[PDB]
């Protein structure tokens, strides 16, 4: 793959996407979840006492470039999962880019959900204002200051399991074979340390199901999570039924559904009918959109697997275009 190019693996039915990262000297390959909703780089380690037997664990003793650090860290994610441990320093190879002396967080403890998932840890791609330890420079910050990328961007392509899965992240460039037409520039609000954007409105057919709302571009979230009122309005448009747990039951047959279209900075971006169905379990389908009690939306994989995004940490801004498919 080209320089700074990282092929991704689509886990299950577009649940999450992970890529291989080499850490240490000579180095081991770790499968990390690429997460724009957080900014800590943490990995399962041999110090871990409740980690998955299947996870690849970083071993400080096997890296001649490991450097001890006296600080500890602890993280708690929106979904209730967590991890904690100690800081360390080592080299990280991201698609051929060798970041020297990156702060890595070695897990000592992790939630069972991590122990049983497919990744060895997370690579945070949010802003450095939300690192859990003050003063930690994120991988993007180091790519930029070490001159490893010449443009402060990363292009993201998330595939659909229905079409073969896959995905691809490119650090410092983007791939026009993955999208169609012109990219639309959208300003980002990073005041909360996230990739925040404003959606002008949402329509289903001729119905305006929502007026402007703010949301965050989160590659680390599976669904399109909307504020209660907006989710309810969307659900009414598709005849979806509330499961009372933040999710909806929708018809498994999407052949009749119209796409959920978002108007962003004057252009149309959609959630195609097939994406309206997240998962099918014993003939019952879970919708691709859910609800949460926040005033902002979490624009997750349901949306990102339909739209290519160039993330520019420099401005900050994003460039979006419908996926080529």
């Amino acid at each position: 793959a080209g320089v700074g190019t990282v092929p991704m693996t689509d886990y299950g039915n577009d649940i999450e996407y992970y890529g291989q990262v080499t850490i240490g000297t000579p180095g081991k390959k770790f499968n990390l979840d690429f997460d724009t909703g957080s900014s800590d780089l943490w990995i399962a380690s041999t110090l871990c006492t409740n980690c998955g037997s299947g996870q690849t664990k970083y071993d400080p003793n096997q890296s001649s470039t490991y450097q001890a650090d006296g600080r500890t860290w602890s993280i708690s994610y929106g979904d209730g999962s967590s991890a904690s441990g100690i800081l360390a320093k080592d080299n990280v190879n991201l698609g051929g880019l060798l970041i020297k002396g990156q702060t890595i967080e070695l897990a000592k403890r992790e939630a069972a959900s991590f122990a049983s998932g497919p990744n060895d840890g997370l690579l945070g791609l949010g802003f450095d204002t939300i690192t859990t330890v003050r003063g930690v420079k994120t991988p993007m910050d180091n790519l930029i200051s070490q001159g490893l990328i010449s443009r402060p961007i990363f292009g993201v392509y998330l595939g659909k399991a229905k079409n073969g899965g896959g995905g691809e992240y490119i650090f410092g460039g983007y791939d026009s074979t993955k999208f169609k037409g012109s990219l639309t520039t959208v300003p980002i609000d990073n005041s909360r340390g996230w990739w925040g954007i404003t959606v002008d409105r949402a329509t289903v057919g001729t119905s305006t199901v929502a007026s402007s709302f703010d949301g965050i571009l989160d590659t680390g979230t599976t669904l399109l999570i909307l504020p209660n009122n907006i989710a309810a309005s969307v659900a009414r448009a598709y005849g979806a039924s509330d499961n009372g747990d933040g999710t909806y039951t929708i018809s498994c047959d999407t052949s009749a559904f119209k796409p959920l279209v978002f108007s962003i900075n004057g252009a149309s971006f959609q959630v195609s009918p097939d994406s309206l169905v997240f998962e099918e379990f014993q003939g019952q389908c879970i919708a691709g959109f859910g609800y949460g009690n926040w005033g902002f939306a979490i624009i997750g994989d349901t949306f990102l697997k339909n739209n290519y995004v160039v993330f520019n940490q420099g401005v900050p801004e994003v460039q979006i275009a419908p996926v080529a498919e």
Binding site: D35, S38, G78, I130, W194, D218, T222, L223, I298
Partner: peptide, 7 residues
Amino acid sequence: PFCXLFX
């Protein structure tokens, strides 16, 4: 489904 700080 996964949901990585605030969400």
